[PDB]
Design a protein around this ligand. Structure first.
Ligand SMILES: O=c1ccn([C@@H]2O[C@H](COP(=O)(O)OP(=O)(O)O)[C@@H](O)[C@H]2O)c(=O)[nH]1
Ligand SMILES: O=c1ccn([C@@H]2O[C@H](COP(=O)(O)OP(=O)(O)O)[C@@H](O)[C@H]2O)c(=O)[nH]1
Ligand SMILES: OC[C@H]1O[C@@H](O)[C@H](O)[C@@H](O)[C@H]1O
Ligand SMILES: OC[C@H]1O[C@@H](O)[C@H](O)[C@@H](O)[C@H]1O
Lengths: 272, 272
């Protein structure tokens, strides 16, 4: 049950003025494509706080990648879901190497030791009891700007920053029919980045279970998809359309790609 | 649980080409605004048939308005949810005046005698057992073009065709603070038409229950909102944002308003 929003004063949306004319803001299956200028975050914040939303954030830091956790977490504290309840889940082979990062109120961090990601995510019972949404990201990254509840939806993927202007034939999908991840040249909506996906816990467990099962099939058949879990995530999202798509604001590499005008904000970026 | 879509061949959506540049296609709370050119109906049809979706359509035909049922139903057979399971619910004081209209397969009609609409809709148990979505419309109308599963979502309203280009101060909301339906001059997103709303059964029962309760408050206080249930529906939708908004394609009056270029299709229209 959703209680009423309080009174709010904000600019009237005008039907005959689009927010953004330069980019596609809704997919052909009627999922929003999340760009700056498309959302009023005050409205969204109210909606999600009235539900007392808890967001879980999963990150894997194995071997040398523990070095990235400090900046990842510190910047997440500045920019990720601020004002909301957050549970970080840090999966690592080196629990003692996790940096001690000071968290804002209503935010917690759990260190989970591990001895791959799709298997490990599909923790099932724990997540269902502890968070409403799961966000699953790469660690070798930093938050530079707002990443908030505008992303939350039952199932989301993120446009890969090297391919958002590309034609589908250029996408680096798995092209061998012998792989579970195969996508023919005349199929595909988008090329999604494996380093930023999420959803409700139920939908994320469905995705990760399906990808893990497909990866095990491929292993048994002696085939490894071209881009590993990202190829399988692409297959899944072709066949199970996401209910929002995040623009490349949400997964960028400034060194490789610069700061194009169509990106008003660079929110989550690769570390050099 | 949602099974995988089959393989499909269709045009690639391109991120750097918008469908429509002339109109707002997503609200600031990230709900799609449904216009022609925003959706691939083949994708949507597949999604909703894989769930074996049933749509209920409610219409009231009291007193002289029974004369409108023939054209309403016949045109609904040509254009409303064709291919999907449909249950029409015709609420009337004259069961014997309901015309005998030939229905396509998978479509049924129930005549419900009545001795107002919000009360009557909030049939609760019946609808929960028999349909997935409810669509609630005026009878003095005809389908001229496709109205399909692109409208379906937990909660939708429709832009009133006299006000989609208007500023909020011009909207004919209830402006007396003594009414439950009151909306100040500096609030409002849109002016929704009371003759076309819908949603999941749960959400429609929430809306109609809330509006009926608010109307009873007003009655007890000796006040009748300016536009009756439509004023209350407006209040509700301001405080409970719809998860899709239908463009005025979906509720038009060609005699009063013509055929403007921004309307590519005239789907559901007033009868002269
Ligand atoms: O030795 C490794 C390799 C990978 N990863 C985790 O797997 C993610 C995906 O790998 P990586 O970021 O290297 O892929 P890339 O972005 O270089 O193609 C990493 O961000 C970490 O989050 C890790 O923890 N340790
Ligand atoms: O005598 C009446 C008056 C109203 N209605 C039902 O109430 C709807 C709303 O009234 P109406 O369509 O007259 O409102 P309008 O569009 O003229 O402002 C009608 O479409 C019917 O669907 C009816 O059945 N009989
Ligand atoms: O072609 C797909 C690849 O594109 C690269 O830019 C990225 O570093 C890889 O992880 C993979 O996503
Ligand atoms: O101002 C609101 C009104 O606008 C009219 O055009 C319509 O006939 C009425 O039913 C009501 O919606």
């Amino acid at each position: 049950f959703m209680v009423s929003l309080p009174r709010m004063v904000y600019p009237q949306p005008k039907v005959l003025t689009p927010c953004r004319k330069d980019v596609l803001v809704v997919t052909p299956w009627l999922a929003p494509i999340v760009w700056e200028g498309t959302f009023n975050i005050d409205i969204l914040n109210e909606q999600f706080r009235l539900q007392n939303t808890t967001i879980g954030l999963t990150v894997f830091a194995i071997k040398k990648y523990v070095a990235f956790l400090k900046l990842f977490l510190e910047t997440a504290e500045k920019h990720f879901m601020v004002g909301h309840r957050v549970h970080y889940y840090v999966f690592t082979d080196q629990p003692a190497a996790v940096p001690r990062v000071t968290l804002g109120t209503g935010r917690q961090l759990s260190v989970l030791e591990v001895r791959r990601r799709m298997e490990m995510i599909s923790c099932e019972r724990r997540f269902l009891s502890e968070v409403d949404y799961l966000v699953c990201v790469d660690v070798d990254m930093e938050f530079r700007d707002h990443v908030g509840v505008e992303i939350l939806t039952p199932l989301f993927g993120t446009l890969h920053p090297s391919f958002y202007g590309s034609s589908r034939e250029a996408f680096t999908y798995e092209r061998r029919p012998q792989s579970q991840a195969y996508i023919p040249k005349d199929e595909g909506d988008f090329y999604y980045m494996g380093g930023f996906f999420g959803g409700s816990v139920q939908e994320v467990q469905r995705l990760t279970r399906a990808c893990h099962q497909a990866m095990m099939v491929d292993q048994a058949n002696g085939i490894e998809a071209v881009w590993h879990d990202e190829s399988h995530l692409n297959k899944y999202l072709l066949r199970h359309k996401p209910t929002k798509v995040l623009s490349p604001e949400y997964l960028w590499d400034q060194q490789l790609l610069g700061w194009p005008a169509v990106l008003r904000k660079l929110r989550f970026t690769a570390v050099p």
